[PDB]
């Protein structure tokens, strides 16, 4: 019916549907976010990498 109410029902279920596609979208922006945190993580590993170049 064209004249039926096009407004959202406030009492529609607001909870997520379990059987919705849990997989990723291929055509989603693969570029970086400019406003991500640019500072170092304190808990990153502070120990040397054994496979770093040992030559001068």
């Amino acid at each position: 019916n064209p004249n039926a109410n096009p407004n959202a029902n406030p009492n529609a279920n607001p909870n997520a549907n379990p059987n919705a596609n849990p997989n990723a979208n291929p055509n989603a922006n693969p570029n970086a976010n400019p406003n991500a945190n640019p500072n170092a993580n304190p808990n990153a590993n502070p120990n040397a990498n054994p496979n770093a170049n040992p030559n001068a």
Partner: antibody
Amino acid sequence: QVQLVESGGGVVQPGRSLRLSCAASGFSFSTYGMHWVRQAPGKGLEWVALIWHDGSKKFYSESVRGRFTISRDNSMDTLYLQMSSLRAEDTAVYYCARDGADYFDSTGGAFDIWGQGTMVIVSS
Amino acid sequence: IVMTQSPATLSVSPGERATLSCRASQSVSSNLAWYQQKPGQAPRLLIYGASTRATGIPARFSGSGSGTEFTLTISSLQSEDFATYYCQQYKTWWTFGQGTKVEIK
């Protein structure tokens, strides 16, 4: 070469906690939703938990909700299941499964790739 | 809970056709899967979408049906096809059937 390898099973007495692991290889792990499926000895299959491709949403069975927690680490291509308050009915083989949905299916698909399975025994 | 029925056991000699059945308490819109499990091994997907074969599945396996009634048909039952077959829906939740065991006649 699409594989799932479970680890972390064994024998645990009732009331304690045990953690399962599932390492993936041969595909892009960060783009798939992951499931846990359970098969008690001599019985059929039972679905346990689901995690989104990014870990945003988690869903659990009525039997394990509140006790079990599903999590993933996309950097290491590994999936986890933390089971606490373990009971005798949790003794089963725990399978790590991949959601076999097309990326534009809108509903989620079957269990495409299953792991080898890990046995969890809850007894005294 | 959408609870899934299946026949218990059917006996077929090698080379014949096997017709498996699957019924659902409610309607699942072509959101049904079929799995093959041999003792001591993990389940293996055969059919998804109630009609579509998985990647490395021989053409002798064929599924059909939609809504409530689903059938799994194996033509020219071979020696490797003797195992338990499971019926699963993924419409409302992820519930399996109790399985149907195919044994050598």
